[PDB]
Design an enzyme around this catalytic site. Structure first.
Site, PDB file in Angstrom:
ATOM      1  N   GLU A 100       0.810  -1.232   0.000  1.00  0.00           N
ATOM      2  CA  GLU A 100       0.000   0.000   0.000  1.00  0.00           C
ATOM      3  C   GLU A 100       0.830   1.262   0.000  1.00  0.00           C
ATOM      4  OE1 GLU A 100      -3.012   0.146  -0.600  1.00  0.00           O
ATOM      5  OE2 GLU A 100      -3.912  -1.797   0.001  1.00  0.00           O
ATOM      6  N   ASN A 130      -8.030   8.454  -5.750  1.00  0.00           N
ATOM      7  CA  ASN A 130      -8.865   7.446  -6.447  1.00  0.00           C
ATOM      8  C   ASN A 130      -9.695   8.065  -7.503  1.00  0.00           C
ATOM      9  OD1 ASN A 130      -9.354   6.222  -3.112  1.00  0.00           O
ATOM     10  ND2 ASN A 130      -7.905   5.453  -4.644  1.00  0.00           N
ATOM     11  N   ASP A 166     -12.747   8.064  -8.102  1.00  0.00           N
ATOM     12  CA  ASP A 166     -14.046   8.540  -7.584  1.00  0.00           C
ATOM     13  C   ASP A 166     -13.856   9.886  -6.848  1.00  0.00           C
ATOM     14  OD1 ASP A 166     -13.003   7.749  -5.132  1.00  0.00           O
ATOM     15  OD2 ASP A 166     -14.788   6.696  -4.479  1.00  0.00           O
ATOM     16  N   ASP A 211      -6.636   7.959  -0.584  1.00  0.00           N
ATOM     17  CA  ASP A 211      -6.136   6.978   0.375  1.00  0.00           C
ATOM     18  C   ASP A 211      -4.925   7.587   1.109  1.00  0.00           C
ATOM     19  OD1 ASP A 211      -7.944   5.134  -0.672  1.00  0.00           O
ATOM     20  OD2 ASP A 211      -6.432   4.063  -1.789  1.00  0.00           O
ATOM     21  N   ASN A 267      -9.081   4.973   3.125  1.00  0.00           N
ATOM     22  CA  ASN A 267      -9.811   5.752   2.122  1.00  0.00           C
ATOM     23  C   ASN A 267     -10.790   6.713   2.758  1.00  0.00           C
ATOM     24  OD1 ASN A 267     -12.410   5.765   0.116  1.00  0.00           O
ATOM     25  ND2 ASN A 267     -10.432   5.604  -0.964  1.00  0.00           N
TER      26      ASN A 267
END
Ligand code: CHT
Ligand code: CL
Ligand code: NA
Length: 129
Positions: A35, A46, A48, A52, A59
């Protein structure tokens, strides 16, 4: 802060992640490796428009507030910036809520795709713990 491998394993254990919800410590170390490369300052936007944050790339859609993710929640009750601290306490506490949410560590797509099923103990191999 960029943690060392065994350094992070030690911090995770001290904050009660080792075997939390049945996930051994190597699972958490492997997830943080893919990650964030063990960097507490890691951020990634992201598609959308959520972001993160931190060593476990938690998120803003659900878990923290960043003021810029419309319609999102803040289920960990924290500013996303807290997830970027050198002290991992807020990331660990919020990760415990995520991994308890129903889908276990599948919440982290990089864990499902790169850690799940693999020899995750290799990630804590040689560490004084
Ligand atoms: C930890 N989350 C579930 C918030 C997303 C992974 O990047
Ligand atoms: Cl599970
Ligand atoms: Na949010």
């Amino acid at each position: 802060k960029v943690f060392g491998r065994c350094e992070l394993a030690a911090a995770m254990k001290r904050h009660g992640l080792d075997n939390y919800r049945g996930y051994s410590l190597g699972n958490w170390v492997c997830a943080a490796k893919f990650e964030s490369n063990f960097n507490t300052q890691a951020t990634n936007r992201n598609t959308d428009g959520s972001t993160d944050y931190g060593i476990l790339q938690i998120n803003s859609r659900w878990w923290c507030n960043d003021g810029r993710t419309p319609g999102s929640r803040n289920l960990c009750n924290i500013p996303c910036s807290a997830l970027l601290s050198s002290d991992i306490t807020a990331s660990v506490n919020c990760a415990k809520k995520i991994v308890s949410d129903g889908n276990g560590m599948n919440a982290w797509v990089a864990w499902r795709n790169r850690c799940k099923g693999t020899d995750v103990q290799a990630w804590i191999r040689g560490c004084r713990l």
